[PDB]
Design a protein around this ligand. Sequence first.
Ligand SMILES: Nc1nc2c(ncn2[C@@H]2O[C@H](COP(=O)(O)OP(=O)(O)NP(=O)(O)O)[C@@H](O)[C@H]2O)c(=O)[nH]1
Ligand SMILES: [Ca+2]
Ligand SMILES: [Mg+2]
Length: 159
Amino acid sequence: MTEYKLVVVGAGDVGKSALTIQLIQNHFVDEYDPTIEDSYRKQVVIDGETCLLDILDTAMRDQYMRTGEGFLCVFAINNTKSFEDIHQYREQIKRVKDSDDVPMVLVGNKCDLAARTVESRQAQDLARSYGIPYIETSAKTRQGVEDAFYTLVREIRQH
Ligand SMILES: Nc1nc2c(ncn2[C@@H]2O[C@H](COP(=O)(O)OP(=O)(O)NP(=O)(O)O)[C@@H](O)[C@H]2O)c(=O)[nH]1
Ligand SMILES: [Ca+2]
Ligand SMILES: [Mg+2]
């Protein structure tokens, strides 16, 4: 079966682990729940293709990073700095992959919140400038979580 190596990156506490554990185990990380594990493997069927997903939940990180085939770049919609950090995460990925054209989706997480400081349009516009999809997610409600990871798999297949 086909394999996909996915890497989840982003600033602290944006929800990298929550998104990954929600996709892998269908439960929501809260305050004091374990996010010590950094790697996850899951067999899933995606558009009729049985897929083996390796997911690296980032906190020898560079050797792991270089092997990623696609990247979820995550910020939280109530964390302006995490959104401003995205450009640096993308630049790092581009350098370690040695490519201007890496499968990537921009994820705006925590879209369940009743107040936000990062507007959807400005994330939409940044993603357009990168040529990549933008998906708003909630690891809490599961909204868009499968959409984000599967869209990333589809971007890797398009590559
Ligand atoms: N309301 C809400 N809170 C969320 C959501 N996703 C994560 N959180 C909360 O945000 C905090 C950090 O989540 P976590 O997944 O650990 O983030 P992280 O990016 O893995 N942090 P770290 O860099 O420490 O690995 C936790 O309190 C978690 O419950 C979400 O979609 N909605
Ligand atoms: Ca293999
Ligand atoms: Mg984490």
